[PDB]
Symmetry: none
Subunit: 400 residues, 4 copies
Amino acid sequence: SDPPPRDWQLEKVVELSRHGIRPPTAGNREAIEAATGRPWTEWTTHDGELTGHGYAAVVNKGREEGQHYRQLGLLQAGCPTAESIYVRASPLQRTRATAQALVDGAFPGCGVAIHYANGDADPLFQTDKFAATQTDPARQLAAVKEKAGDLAQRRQALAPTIQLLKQAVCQADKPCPIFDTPWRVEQSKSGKTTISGLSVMANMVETLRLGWSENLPLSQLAWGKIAQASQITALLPLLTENYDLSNDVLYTAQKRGSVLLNAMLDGVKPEASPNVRWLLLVAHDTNIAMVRTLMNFSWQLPGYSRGNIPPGSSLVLERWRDAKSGERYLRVYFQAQGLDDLRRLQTPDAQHPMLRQEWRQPGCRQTDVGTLCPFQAAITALGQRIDRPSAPAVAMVLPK
Amino acid sequence: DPPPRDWQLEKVVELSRHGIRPPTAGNREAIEAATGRPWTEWTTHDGELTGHGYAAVVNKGREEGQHYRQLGLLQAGCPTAESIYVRASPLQRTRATAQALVDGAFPGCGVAIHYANGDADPLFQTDKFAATQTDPARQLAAVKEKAGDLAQRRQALAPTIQLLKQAVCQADKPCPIFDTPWRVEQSKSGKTTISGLSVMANMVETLRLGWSENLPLSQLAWGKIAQASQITALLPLLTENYDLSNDVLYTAQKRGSVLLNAMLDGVKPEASPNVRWLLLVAHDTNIAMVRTLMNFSWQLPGYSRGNIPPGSSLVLERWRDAKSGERYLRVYFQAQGLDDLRRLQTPDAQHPMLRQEWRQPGCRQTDVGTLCPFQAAITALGQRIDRPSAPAVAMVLPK
Amino acid sequence: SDPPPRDWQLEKVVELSRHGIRPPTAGNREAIEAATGRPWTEWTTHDGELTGHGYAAVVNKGREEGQHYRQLGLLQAGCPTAESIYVRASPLQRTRATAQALVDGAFPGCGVAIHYANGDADPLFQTDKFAATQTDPARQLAAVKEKAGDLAQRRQALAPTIQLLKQAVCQADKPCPIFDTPWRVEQSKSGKTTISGLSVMANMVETLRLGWSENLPLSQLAWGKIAQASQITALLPLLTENYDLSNDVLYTAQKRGSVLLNAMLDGVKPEASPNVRWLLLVAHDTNIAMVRTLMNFSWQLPGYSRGNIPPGSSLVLERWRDAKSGERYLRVYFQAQGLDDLRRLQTPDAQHPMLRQEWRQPGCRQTDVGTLCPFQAAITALGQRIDRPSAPAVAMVLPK
Amino acid sequence: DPPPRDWQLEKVVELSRHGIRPPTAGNREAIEAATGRPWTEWTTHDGELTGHGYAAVVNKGREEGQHYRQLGLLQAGCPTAESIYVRASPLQRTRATAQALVDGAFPGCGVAIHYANGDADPLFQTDKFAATQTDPARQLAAVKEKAGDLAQRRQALAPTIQLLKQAVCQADKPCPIFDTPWRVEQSKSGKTTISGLSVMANMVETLRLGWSENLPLSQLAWGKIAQASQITALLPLLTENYDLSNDVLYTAQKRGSVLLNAMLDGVKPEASPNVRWLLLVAHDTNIAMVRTLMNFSWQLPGYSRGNIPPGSSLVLERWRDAKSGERYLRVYFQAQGLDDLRRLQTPDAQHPMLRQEWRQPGCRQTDVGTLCPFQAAITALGQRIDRPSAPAVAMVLPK
Ligand SMILES: [Mg+2]
Ligand code: NA
Ligand code: NA
Ligand code: NA
Ligand code: NA
Ligand code: NA
């Protein structure tokens, strides 16, 4: 490495990470097995929990990240103190274990603890469980229908991708129910709004992507039908489509993601509590999608479709200072590993770097540390779509 | 006086312990009763392979794959059916460890592992098969005979017991286990244990595993243990318990002969399956019985005599000198150190695996390690095998 | 450690180190053996070369120093580049080997090279070998006599210390010539000005101090007569006195030290060549004494007399920046290890820290990183006594 | 089946190599002639102990002192006349290494070392004493007999020779040594060498020492060598040369018997001097002859068979079980790894010394290592000693 930058100084990191690789959730399994009329692989990890390979991949990212932040002088050599980091994970096993993996890698052998809510609902993450942040089913129905438009036309436009999925998952000369169902907007008794057909197809594509990333034997991924990363990439358009029509619907993102984006923007400002160098939040792709929608931030990384959120990927806000003037800037980016890098447990070292895309707007400047945006203007732009009634203050430090 | 050599590695037979787990459900009940307090609940289910445990096993498997490619045992790239066969005990923790090993050794290659359909593999769960079960009266006598004066044994380990008590007992509260005399105990199903000692051994294994896991110190032993040397100081209790259980010769003969026999058969030419690397993944109890039958033990840095760390393994290597055509066996045990496990250090050139080799007269020092004339080595290693307890198994399972 | 400072940023280090522990020089030995009428211990190291124990002690300081500068974010993690450091050593073996020891410690296993002049004279260090920087014997005679004043009175005032030295080094009922010689100003045929009696006594005290620091057996240090560090400390007043009347004479320091102080002050300024994070110069106590005299900087560290310069000790200038404004400051200090720490090869970790004294003047402020002085005013004050004709520009990067 | 034990370490006898040196003057002449080019001039005089070498030895001695205090062999604080006696070969490099060891082991204690007044110590410079010199005709025959077909030996090491040539030869220039057939050569004073091989061995030792020294890569092998594995790959040439010189049994018997005899006598009770630790500091040639008489060799991570790194040592430990009163011998060789030396890594719990133990039938694994019944061990270790070449020496020198 070259010596660390002096003219630019990193002050604060706020990071929102997805959990690492998991098998399908119990609900996902029910759906995909019904959709294809056959059982899918049972993994060595319990459905919905972080797999060992998932933990290992997250450690690899955390290790390179900790080295990077020591190199830049944000963190101390050796083990951290309370001033170094605060980790808040969604209370699910998969997110707690992912949070452990990140600090396990970033601070080798340091026994760094994580924090999570006592109950099974954290108001930053399980926003459908709190009055201020719940959607109204009637509004969500309208919103999804408005964005979806002609669903027959969307289904026809995805026909080639649907065909690739069918080839991978359907048994020769057997019923494959899901490919016969027309795409329509449906609501559950709890008022969750999904698209018939597409939503379960999206569950299938995520499961295949996760199985690829896991390094499952090919015989156990899609019955030997998928053998290269490009074949996963070709399926991802269905997942993007489902996201466009669920988590990335503005109404839904405003109701269910405003509290988290608000917490993140406040967290990157000076005078944040807790007073730490790195605030690390670990949650779900749902949360990341809603936040990036409110940010109006879109990405497309090599080997992935638009907006894809891989396991152990993260959205980062960094506050930087021009040391020649004290003027503050924000850097905003999304990072992930590629499909084969995850499968191979490749460390994201200098030669196989993380995939990354930075947000920008007029007035941002390209520096040796990344794209830096005047701080207040960046905060204002990123926060425009926040629904204030849906963004109550949350104490970041869990009482614990 | 070594002759001209052209060393070629022909076959590896490896018996690995599973990686790091939290206490088993049974362990937890015993240790929580023994100390009168709850112990940390890990993010991994009791008895399963932890994420950190998986990561540490990947690291070992990655360097091992590189090594055996460098030696020409394994071809470049992904393996074939002739490269490797992996058989794991059917428990989640052993299945998951088997996966981690080939995940590291053959990056991104989707290498499968194999395990029994039921809850019992006749190589590993040997107490579930008549031919390989101990007789209760014979086992009781063997354990009594080896234990001798247990009051003296307990008094001899007093400093170690005190260190354990300091770590796990609450000030000004009862701590039941430390008040129990050590006595032989035998269950209705025939399992012989030592009262006091055996539960203390469970406690020490739990603390060693929690250290190796990189648990926060507050959740390891309530902040009382902060360095690896404090774990090392407790391990004599684990060695003592092993001496009086898995390492009792009679027990090892009944419950371990089938596995050692299978390993010695696997390392000979014409083995089924025909693979360059036979990888077996099981439990410390299995390794302990096997090494006892071999009359082989070890002492590695930071560990007590015969300690079997998570992800450690016993290895048999068959070597040929391509010039003379003579064949040799190399036998060793390998593990990572305490801090290396805690830190997820990959075992590279600067941080090598800890290793000790077996030898007997006739063995020679070579550029590839201690190599022993093959026939004499297999014969010597099999001398303690109890023939009626060694039925031949099919190594390749159904699928 | 706590996280590195953000409001204060270290930009540049310029360091002038003494060589590490050596046996007496060949000249020293001749003098001290004549002075006491007996042979002194022959060390395992050649006279005047860096001892192995000396190298080890210097490595210990370099190792903690490299860790410190990575912690503060001046240096990169891992091995350095050309931008990290430039090391220029006096061409003597003792100074080359000391320079190697410092980077050996600071950058473990990195094979960092050092630089030194092809000949046996470097114009920053062997200043008596270059026309612009040589003293005139007639002026030096006047200068030493002026400062020395009544030498009989100085000798009488040091009588208790002289007695302690006699006790350590003189044989019972044998001639010890040096203690009979009156103190007078003398000049050699080359025009070097020394004080008779005192100068050789100072040679003796340095040799004893170095033998203590070396961990020589007590039987080989002063024939068993010195057994604790306090006994070395008690002798050091003679060394301070000799320094006051040689290297610390203003005239001499101006002629022979201006070129080096000038190079050092220019080196800590922005726009210095070479463009490096750390300029490390390795030379002799003579050079350090002249420089601190020109700086008007005096120190007294625990266990040492005023101005003492221990083996492997150094004078440091650091340029710091207030990251809230870009305003620049200078920190100036002298550092060493204590006598027992050197003898024991103690690493100067957090629990046995380097002994240090900082320079200051009105306007300096105490910060969490040390005493910081407004940069231009500090440069001006430190440079007041430079004799400009004696301070020619020197290319810092050796052609080489 | 171990009995109750209370292990007490009673005596250590240690034979250490000197630490890192540059090439000797003689080495430099040979290697510069062999490659037709000047080699780096170090800041240390040819053949002397380097500053880095001193520092690395201090590190080892520091951890060793701590260890032997922890075991109760050495009292707390500074030693007494009964704690240690240090005898070094009279060369600067060995005297300086002896100092470094006690400098580390007993911080700030002014511990003295001892050496012969002349240029020859009868334990170490054995060729300078009639009883312990080889006969020229017998030595020539022994070396010829072991060497056999040297053309085959040279052809067998061709890949290694090529790696050396790539590191040290200038492109498009003559490199004399690589064009010489390997032949037995005997000087007028009786010294037997192998043409080609012996100078290549000098080159490999120089490169290994330069690596260990932390020389800039540009000054090591003109930038051609950048990692430890490249040094490891060259070491077979050093092993080959040792096999045909210091490790020839006849040679070792004549020139090594006096030293092994003194070591075995020193490790027995009632030794003179009465000290807890007898420390001898000499040369790789001495260690090689001693281990050959012991029929003991090793292979440590990153090193070829029997390699003797700078600051490495052979150790004999006499242990007593305080319960039974039985006595045991433990025998091992220890060294630091290549990167550890280069980096001046202290050998702490996380970076332990590399070690291999000797054993024979009857030895047992214990909590303090491989321990061998004392009388049987000393007898077995002394079996190859040539009695006429083993006069008794006074261990304590005049001063
Ligand atoms: Mg290390
Ligand atoms: Na840093
Ligand atoms: Na689209
Ligand atoms: Na659990
Ligand atoms: Na004075
Ligand atoms: Na030299």
